[PDB]
């Protein structure tokens, strides 16, 4: 559960970065 | 039949159940009304496909000006795609609501295991029909109130603003050689 | 490239929707977890209690239908086969 | 009858329209046999 939780955290941050990139590219 | 038998023998599991139990009916219908998530999404995507085909078909006759049919299609189709997410979300949420209460005071009619399972099946089939009716009457309405009766208002209200506001007015209307 | 972007954006929004709920209980994490430990202990204890009651008493909320599924009906088959162990073991005649 | 109808209406708390709940019978017999406790103690007193 600890590795799963940390990997969830990293996944959430990576998805946030990906959506920021979509925002700054779609413009 | 086997699943219902085990549900009956387990939800009053410690004590002799002298009445046909109820959470078994709830569990069967809840386990069966969750497979609807595929056909409804398939219907939504199929309607999306035909409605994009219609936009292309009814923009083809605008070939008088090139470089504007492209913009018009690129705007309307993007709007339809931006709306597919919302309509699919509402489509999922409708049946997810249906998985909540299992109403039985509707016009749904009111060893020992075989009789109990037969009585459970005669009710499960009825409620399957009555939830099929309610999802069949609200899948069209759900799609159109979100997709069609909204893209229509987008066309009639907002398309002009986007087309006039996009840059290079002189090149948005290219005279075709023809 | 720019045509594909709406699909990617909505799909990743759906995935972030899936993960945000798990992030809700995971906003913060300090060493030694002064209160998360107690909260999780309570959650585990409540889960165990409700699952015990569901397994034996037969509470609601989707008891599994795969197997004979738990002590409750095994415990019953004991309470209704013991009236066979009473009959079987005890007998005598023509000596009485 | 009213006493057991209320039990029906409480253990059918939110869900609806199903046959009969057995724990209504359970609760009512548990309420009926809780007053047997007085005559038995009275008989013990009489035997004493």
Residue numbers in the entry:
A (entry chain P): 721 to 747
B (entry chain N): 385 to 494, 653 to 720
C (entry chain P): 289 to 384
D (entry chain I2): 385 to 432
Sentences from the paper on this structure:
Dynamin (isoforms 1, 2, and 3) is the founding member of a ubiquitous superfamily of large GTPases and is best known for its role in catalyzing membrane scission of cargo-loaded vesicles during endocytosis. Two hinges are present; Hinge 1 connects the BSE and the Stalk whereas Hinge 2 connects the BSE and the G domain. Various cryoEM reconstructions confirmed that a GG dimer interface forms between two dynamin monomers in helical configurations, and the three conserved Stalk interfaces are vital for dynamin to polymerize into filaments.
Here, we report the structure of a two-start dynamin helix at 3.74 Å resolution. The three dynamin domains are radially distributed, with the G domain making up the outer surface layer, the BSE in the short middle layer, connecting the G domain and the inner Stalk domain layer, which forms an extended oligomer. The two-start helix comprises of two strands, which are joined by the conserved GG dimeric interfaces contributed by the GTPase domains of the two opposing strands. The density for the bound GMP-PCP nucleotide is clearly discernible (inset). The two monomers of the GG dimer share the same overall architecture but are not symmetrical, consistent with the GG dimer in the one-start helix12. Furthermore, the Stalk interface 2 and interface 3 serve as fulcrum points to allow small relative rotations of the Stalk domains, while preserving interface 1 accordingly.
